[PDB]
Amino acid sequence: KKKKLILFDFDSTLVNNETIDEIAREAGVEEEVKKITKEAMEGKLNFEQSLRKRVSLLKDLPIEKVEKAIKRITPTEGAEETIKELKNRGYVVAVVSGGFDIAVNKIKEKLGLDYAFANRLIVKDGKLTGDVEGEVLKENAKGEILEKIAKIEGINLEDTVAVGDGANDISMFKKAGLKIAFCAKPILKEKADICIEKRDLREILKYIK
Ligand code: ALF
Ligand SMILES: [Mg+2]
């Protein structure tokens, strides 16, 4: 029983939604933020700068509204069944995201994931301050996290799998044993071993040892 590890990106992969675009709707800036999110996922913008820019537009948004947005996030088709089978096949399952703990940790709890890494929205007096902080901002951040988790678990990098859809998943792919682009952007598909174009996470299972 050689241990294995699979890491999932969150927005548009493990869940249907883009967390930040949902929150942007509550702040009345959905269109503006969605445009930046798309450019960042296409690899046209630096991730950290793009995230800080989007989060500044959310300044003063009440936490009550952030929560309403988060309540709308739903797991991607086949997420539960895929996670179950992955655990049956002996995998440690993790979610690594450039999104936010308040949304990611809910799903980590709901789906029973082993690890969850995300950034943090800063709040004061019940409202967003417009700032974000975290360790999933730099270009190489996700790759470093994959290595960190694998090291803790004593899992060889060759026995790791990464599933993602955007440009900030590139460093995660770089360190992964098997790279799966799930209904992904061109910049990521070019770096993938396997490209899945049907939106059902169960489609990755046929490729998993
Ligand atoms: F959850 Al992501 F880029 F979609 F970190
Ligand atoms: Mg994504």
Side-chain angles (χ1 to χ4, degrees):
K1 308 305 222 43
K2 167 162 297 190
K3 278 279 200 182
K4 295 170 292 186
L5 168 70
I6 184 175
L7 273 68
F8 286 93
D9 161 63
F10 186 73
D11 301 297
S12 295
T13 296
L14 197 52
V15 299
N16 291 301
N17 332 57
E18 277 295 328
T19 301
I20 199 168
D21 291 349
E22 291 289 6
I23 302 177
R25 181 183 179 91
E26 305 301 313
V29 295
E30 191 170 1
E31 233 39 49
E32 190 176 1
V33 172
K34 276 174 67 180
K35 179 181 176 68
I36 298 166
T37 297
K38 178 172 183 294
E39 288 174 16
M41 292 306 92
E42 291 170 341
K44 303 183 175 300
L45 300 173
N46 172 267
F47 183 71
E48 178 168 347
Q49 291 185 336
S50 78
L51 193 62
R52 290 187 186 285
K53 182 169 174 165
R54 279 172 287 160
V55 172
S56 288
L57 290 168
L58 308 176
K59 178 181 174 299
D60 293 321
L61 185 64
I63 190 63
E64 54 180 87
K65 282 179 179 189
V66 169
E67 287 299 337
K68 288 194 170 194
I70 291 177
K71 192 176 179 59
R72 292 199 301 273
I73 300 166
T74 62
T76 292
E77 175 179 335
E80 289 78 8
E81 297 88 341
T82 296
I83 296 308
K84 177 181 181 59
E85 178 61 23
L86 285 173
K87 286 180 156 185
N88 287 356
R89 297 192 195 179
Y91 283 76
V92 171
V93 181
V95 55
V96 173
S97 173
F100 317 110
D101 276 355
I102 50 177
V104 175
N105 288 334
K106 299 193 55 185
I107 300 304
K108 164 199 171 182
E109 303 293 329
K110 181 193 175 179
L111 301 183
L113 311 183
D114 299 297
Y115 291 89
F117 288 82
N119 296 133
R120 302 174 293 280
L121 279 170
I122 306 307
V123 196
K124 184 172 173 57
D125 298 307
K127 302 165 290 197
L128 300 185
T129 63
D131 296 317
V132 55
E133 298 307 324
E135 298 70 54
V136 203
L137 293 172
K138 302 182 190 177
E139 191 279 333
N140 68 185
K142 294 198 179 189
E144 283 178 3
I145 292 175
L146 186 154
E147 295 195 284
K148 294 196 218 216
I149 295 170
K151 184 43 126 70
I152 287 165
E153 297 289 339
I155 292 165
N156 188 295
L157 293 182
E158 290 299 278
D159 298 316
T160 65
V161 179
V163 181
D165 75 281
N168 63 324
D169 295 321
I170 284 175
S171 71
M172 187 173 62
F173 270 22
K174 191 163 188 166
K175 297 308 200 326
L178 180 59
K179 307 148 166 60
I180 302 182
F182 180 73
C183 300
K185 291 302 187 177
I187 193 175
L188 188 67
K189 293 200 286 181
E190 189 279 316
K191 293 303 175 86
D193 293 319
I194 302 305
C195 286
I196 289 162
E197 300 307 326
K198 182 166 290 183
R199 178 167 284 277
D200 182 344
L201 288 160
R202 283 169 304 196
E203 293 290 328
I204 68 170
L205 297 169
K206 72 187 76 78
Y207 299 98
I208 314 292
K209 185 178 184 279

